[PDB]
Amino acid sequence: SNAYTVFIDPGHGGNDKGTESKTSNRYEKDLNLQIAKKLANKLSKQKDIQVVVSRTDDTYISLKDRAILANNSSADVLVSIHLNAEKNGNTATGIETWYRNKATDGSKELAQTVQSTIVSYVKVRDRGIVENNFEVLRESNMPAILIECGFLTTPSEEQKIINEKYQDQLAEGIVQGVLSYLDSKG
Ligand SMILES: [Zn+2]
DSSP code for 131: E
DSSP 8-state assignment for residue 44: H
Beta bridge partners of 129: 97
Q: To 10 degrees, the CA torsion angle through 92, 53, 77, 60?
A: 60
The bridge status of strand 144-151 relative to strand 77-84 is parallel
In the structure, ligand 1 is a single-atom ion and the residues with CB under 5 Å from it are 11, 18, 82
Report the distance separating Cα 165 and Cα 169, nearest Å. Answer: 6
Experimental method: X-ray
CA of 95 to the centre of ligand 1 (A): 13
Q: In what order do the strands lie in the sheet with 95-99?
A: 49-53, 4-10, 77-84, 144-151, 95-99, 126-131
Cα 4 to ligand 1 centre (Å): 26
* DSSP 3-state of 8: strand
Q: Is 135 annotated as a binding residue?
A: no
Give the span between the Cα atoms of 1 and 16, in whole angstroms: 38
Ligand 1 centroid distance, CA of 148 (Å): 8
Give me the active site residues, please: 148
* 158 belongs to an annotated ligand binding site: no
109 a known binding residue?
A: no
- The structure was resolved to a resolution in Å of 1.7
Torsion 149-166-33-153 (CA) sign:
positive
What contacts 184, CB < 8 A, 6 or more positions away?
A: none
DSSP letter for 153, please: T
The SS3 assignment for 121 reads: helix
Contact 108, 128 (CB under 8 A): no
Q: Please say whether the beta carbons of 83 and 151 come within 8 A.
A: yes
Report the topology of domain 1-186: Aminopeptidase (3.40.630)
CA of 47 to the centre of ligand 1 (A): 30
Provide the β-strand partners of residue 20.
27
Q: How far apart are CA 181 and CA 82, in angstroms?
A: 20
Domain positions in the chain? 1-186
Distances (CA, A) of 116 to 17, 61, 97, 133, 147: 28, 29, 10, 22, 12
Phi (first) and psi of residue 7, to 5 degrees: -95, 120
Coil, strand or helix: which one is 166? helix
* Beta carbons of 144 and 70 less than 8 angstroms apart: yes
Under a CB-based contact definition with an 8 Å cutoff, are residues 34 and 167 in contact? yes
Question: What's the CA angle centered on 67, arms 109 and 119, to 5 degrees?
Answer: 35
